[PDB]
Amino acid sequence: KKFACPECPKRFMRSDHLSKHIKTHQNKK
Ligand SMILES: [Zn+2]
Secondary structure, eight states: OOOOOSSSSOOOSOSHHHHHHHHHHSOOO
């Protein structure tokens, strides 16, 4: 699939890993 992180320009053909990647992207403030 055509995945794309809204926080970075990097992309991953998989979505499972995108969960851990996008997770760290956000923080609890
Ligand atoms: Zn990202």
